[PDB]
Ligand binder design. Structure first.
Ligand SMILES: O=C(O)[C@@](O)(COP(=O)(O)O)[C@H](O)[C@H](O)COP(=O)(O)O
Ligand SMILES: O=C(O)[C@@](O)(COP(=O)(O)O)[C@H](O)[C@H](O)COP(=O)(O)O
Ligand SMILES: [Mg+2]
Lengths: 447, 83, 90
């Protein structure tokens, strides 16, 4: 009965507020928009703000059923190519990444008005951040658990990615751990394959983990892969890994999905497990610099829901990466307050409100020669996964795992002495190779 | 962002085994959701019944919609607002 | 769902038939008319014929539900002042 003003109304007249000063309880977002020719930046930034919020392509009669200014998002700033949108606190459901990742980065990425759209960063407010559990164990409790301190913990994926039977899989695991690696892991595509089922693999591996742990006199582990086609199966494999006495489980937290990942994280904490999170399929999001979701957003989502490790990527490996952006991401997972650094891809000051940190895992195609670079970028609190750089040694996995361990020890020991690692990496590695034959074979094979 | 004017193009792509969702095209009616729902329902049935007698949709879509709006006030107000 | 041309139409275009031949069963009325200044003589006679018969002041949809030409009266001759109107026996 009551009459309103229906009709298609341009977005920027109610979803663009250049004079808006955000509160401390708002999810701010920094989109990198690329609009259609003839469509202005201001109007496109309003289209992104409206459709990840209370808006639509017309004016509806039910806009007067509620106070729309209490809930609408708005683009409060534009820096030429980057649009700053401030989302109210009430728009989101507590303790669910699946709600942020279905609202902010949902249907807005595929409009005809915007040719390209990348979500660069995002400011999680403490009010909404407090409703999350955070990583189950973190850095310090994990270092205590393994009884390893003051060095970057090593690792390595078991190669080839697939094909090895359960018996032969556990012999490679034994050689790596006995060689000197602190941990081995399953590969992202090895879950329950016919050539190597999971009950066979879980039992065989922990037999090799326990055997290697006893002889070498130090604590070991293996990131058994529990991801599967459903959450019930995923939780069933997590319990079996717990009853076997394992310390770790690994999950593909992007291919399995955030809801299943949050379900597994709760079940893993109740089982006293340490949950490594592999970032498989992230490149589909964040390879191109003009469209997608930058990993510093997916890294923020991981820490909130809870994850002991994630791959931040080696900037010198076979996978793409920027040294500056990785440095911001690495300190986005470990520090407690991260001031915004425009020179490091960071837009907003991120207070973490007591959530415990995360190991940045540095995996990729990294051999011994990359250790001087890797240590400087990350430091002590990191994992260096030499997957193919261990088994690729001229004399097997045991010799290779010894070379990686020596290379990390020599470089770190030199850092504490005071030497400049970047300029003296080759000198330090050759000093170590003067006494380590295993390193010498590897250091010249891949050099 | 579909409305009544897009019905001829939609029925010519998907056929009968499909769903058509009018979110803003229902509440965006200048008079309410119930009026908008009737406008969208009459639009689909008018095109579907016209396709069932051999009328080329991609040619006579506007003619079919005008013919239906001649006796449906809701559809008449829907096309007078959009396009 | 049945289109018809609504709106007011003159009485002249559907109730004045100068070529009509009265039957031996029709009732003929010799009306003497004096229209308003600004109303044609051959138009007022159509109004008298229409409103003593099926017609009214606007086209109604229900006119299509009857064979109107069977029942409607029609002025068939005008001598300036006196107009002749033929009414069907039915
Ligand atoms: O091939 C693999 O999948 C690896 O095991 C590398 O094996 P190599 O160590 O033999 O290269 C790791 O998962 C990748 O580093 C993943 O890349 P990201 O770290 O970006 O997830
Ligand atoms: O969320 C929305 O915007 C809609 O409800 C549209 O409402 P309107 O009909 O009012 O625009 C649809 O879900 C999107 O179009 C989804 O796009 P797709 O289905 O192509 O993923
Ligand atoms: Mg892998």
């Amino acid at each position: 009965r009551a009459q309103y003003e229906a009709g298609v109304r341009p977005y920027r007249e109610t979803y663009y507020d250049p004079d808006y000063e955000p509160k401390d309880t708002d999810l701010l977002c920094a989109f990198r928009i690329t609009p259609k020719p003839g469509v202005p930046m201001e109007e496109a930034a309003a289209a992104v703000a409206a459709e990840s919020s209370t808006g639509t392509w017309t004016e509806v009669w039910s806009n007067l059923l509620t106070d729309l200014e209490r809930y609408k998002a708005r683009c409060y700033r534009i820096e030429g190519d980057v649009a700053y949108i401030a989302y109210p606190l009430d728009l989101f459901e507590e303790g669910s990444i699946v709600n942020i990742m279905s609202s902010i980065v949902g249907n807005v990425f595929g409009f005809k008005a915007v040719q390209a759209l990348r979500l660069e960063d995002m400011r999680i407010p403490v009010a909404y951040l407090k409703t999350f559990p955070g990583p189950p164990t973190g850095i310090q409790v994990e270092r205590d658990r393994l009884n390893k301190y003051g060095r970057p913990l090593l690792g390595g994926t078991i190669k080839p990615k697939l094909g090895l039977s359960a018996k032969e899989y556990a012999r490679v695991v034994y050689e790596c751990l006995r060689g000197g690696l602190d941990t081995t892991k399953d590969d992202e595509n090895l879950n329950s394959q016919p050539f190597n089922r999971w009950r066979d693999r879980f039992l065989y591996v922990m037999e090799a983990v326990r055997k290697a742990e006893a002889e070498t006199g130090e604590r070991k582990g293996h990131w058994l892969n529990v991801t599967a086609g459903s959450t019930e199966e995923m939780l069933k494999r997590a319990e079996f890994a717990a009853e076997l006495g394992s310390r770790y489980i690994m999950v593909d937290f992007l291919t399995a999905g955030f809801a299943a990942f949050a379900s597994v994280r709760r079940r893993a904490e109740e089982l006293g497990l340490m949950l490594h999170c592999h970032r498989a399929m992230h490149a589909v999001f964040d390879r191109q610099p003009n469209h997608g979701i930058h990993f510093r957003v997916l890294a923020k989502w991981l820490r909130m829901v809870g994850g002991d490790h994630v791959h931040t990527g080696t900037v010198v490996g076979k996978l793409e990466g920027d040294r500056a952006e990785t440095l911001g991401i690495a300190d986005l997972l470990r520090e407690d307050y991260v001031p915004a650094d425009p020179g490091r891809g960071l837009f907003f000051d991120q207070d973490w409100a007591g959530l415990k940190p995360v190991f940045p895992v540095a995996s990729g195609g990294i051999h011994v020669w990359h250790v001087p670079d890797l240590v400087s970028i990350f430091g002590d609190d990191a994992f260096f996964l030499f997957g193919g750089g261990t088994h690729g040694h001229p004399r097997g996995s045991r010799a290779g795992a010894t070379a990686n361990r020596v290379a990390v020890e020599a470089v770190v020991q030199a850092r504490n002495e005071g030497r400049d690692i970047l300029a003296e990496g080759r000198e330090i590695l050759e000093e170590a190779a003067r006494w380590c034959p295993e390193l010498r074979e590897a250091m010249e094979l891949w050099g």
